[PDB]
Design a protein around this ligand. Structure first.
Ligand SMILES: Nc1nc2c(ncn2[C@@H]2O[C@H](COP(=O)(O)O)[C@@H](O)[C@H]2O)c(=O)[nH]1
Ligand SMILES: Nc1nc2c(ncn2[C@@H]2O[C@H](COP(=O)(O)O)[C@@H](O)[C@H]2O)c(=O)[nH]1
Lengths: 208, 208
């Protein structure tokens, strides 16, 4: 039989701050069920390569099948909300993450395993609590990039990747936080490489 | 529906018109082999899916090696020129196409097979001859998008995908032509889905 090699090296576990996704010039919409909790939400678990490149949309014959994760839906509704317009259930977002990223790690996790791992990592890495534990709150104030990185490093033991975007007022703000997981999906690891964060020395942590 | 490949659905065989790549606000540079012939050049062979998505960067451990295509180099220099700046040999362009697209079909064609297939497809489909036979010439004049599509469809049996970019005056021009091939790369097929053309009803076919 033909043996196929893994198409990726490690994973980026990415979380987004709703306050930064919703205060730009573009529109954002709360899920049909209402305003999500003021906590970071899961964006996705992304297979990536050591050289910075990453595989995407790896298996057209492995379409998202929500029935395979029915027992995880309530947790996904709370921890993986969609903020796109018009107001959605979250399914289009979850389907997109599985088809674009999950399929590229099919040899490691099937659909249930993929979403479960993301949920477990989310509970393992509570960014809001870690940051507020260090006096960094989503109150519209400004914080140094290094204070954010180090507060997280001291808490989980690994250096995070920080991505920023811009609000309407033109201020640079904390948008997404990346944590690396080994290729086997078993444990956290230091990131072999970090994407361009586009952050200033000091950034805003907007209220939501 | 019929499938011919395991991880993706079909292929887009894409060719570019040099006159349209070189007359925009961006710079273009003739390759080290000199000014290319005034004919369409290969852009690449791209695995694509029925839902519009496409796999990309499927194997970072499979770098492009010119040794794998040594016997195809002459054909590649003549039919697959790079027009990017600064003037290049073409290796960076061919390497990019393999890394981004070729690797995603590595279980169908290896490097030599991939480049050979693209070269063979170009031999089979002479777009310039087909168009000029239908009175559509690269003389800077405008032609109907429909007449361009009909000419190609009458010749090969299926409608092509047509993509337009913009020239210095802002006008849409015939830039790239997409031909659909099944997942095995052995036969032309009706396109399950077409690229967003961004073409007006009348487009220019610029000189080169
Ligand atoms: N960042 C983000 N994308 C969302 C959300 N809901 C739906 N989407 C969609 O998911 C895509 C994310 O692609 P990715 O960043 O995983 O490669 C977005 O471009 C958008 O179409 C949301 O709440 N946040
Ligand atoms: N269209 C085009 N791209 C070229 C050429 N030479 C080098 N390139 C590079 O190849 C890339 C094409 O990526 P693709 O369209 O295959 O996904 C471009 O972004 C550019 O960096 C050329 O002659 N035409």
């Amino acid at each position: 039989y033909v043996e196929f090699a893994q198409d990726f090296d490690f994973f980026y576990f990415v979380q987004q701050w709703p306050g930064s996704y919703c205060d730009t010039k573009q529109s954002c919409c709360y899920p049909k069920t209402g305003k999500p909790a003021s906590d970071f939400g899961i964006h996705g678990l992304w297979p990536n390569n050591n050289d910075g490149s990453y595989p995407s949309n790896c298996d057209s014959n492995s379409p998202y099948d929500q029935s395979q994760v029915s027992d995880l839906i309530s947790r996904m509704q709370q921890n993986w909300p969609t903020l796109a317009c018009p107001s959605g259930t979250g399914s289009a977002f979850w389907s997109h993450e599985w088809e674009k990223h999950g399929t590229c790690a099919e040899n490691v996790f099937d659909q249930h395993g993929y979403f479960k791992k993301a949920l477990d990592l989310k509970n393992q890495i509570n960014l809001l609590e870690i940051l507020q534990g260090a006096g960094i709150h989503p109150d519209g104030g400004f914080y140094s990039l290094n204070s954010i990185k180090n507060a997280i490093r001291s808490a989980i033991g690994y250096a995070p990747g920080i991505e920023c975007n811009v609000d309407e007022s033109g201020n640079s703000q904390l948008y997404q936080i990346y944590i690396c997981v080994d290729g086997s999906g078993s444990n956290l690891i230091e990131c072999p490489i970090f994407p361009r964060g586009k952050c200033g020395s000091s950034i805003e942590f907007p209220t939501f």
